[PDB]
Amino acid sequence: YIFSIVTTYFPGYQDFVNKIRSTIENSFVGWELEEVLLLDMSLDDGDSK
Amino acid sequence: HFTPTPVSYTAGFYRIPVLGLTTRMSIYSDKSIHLSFLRTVPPYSHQSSV
């Protein structure tokens, strides 16, 4: 009953995340979303961040 | 708008990069449809910031 989301810079990933958020938002049952991450792996020396 | 489709679709097979000079249509903005594309003018999206 609890989960989080993480996606790369792919636009399909963002579309799927938006669809999942819209589907889980209007739910009669409970749901707990911690946070969402949109880290980009194309950056140089950004692996530390 | 039709001229950018054939060359890009043909060159996307071998993942060869392609640079556009006078293309301004907003349809070729997401990298999903058009994988490799370089621009030399501003898209119509910059009109929103303007």
Side-chain angles (χ1 to χ4, degrees), chain A residues 11-12 30 46, chain B residues 4 6 11-12 17 20 25 28 37 42-44:
Chain B
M25 266 309 315
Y28 298 99
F37 195 33
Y44 284 178

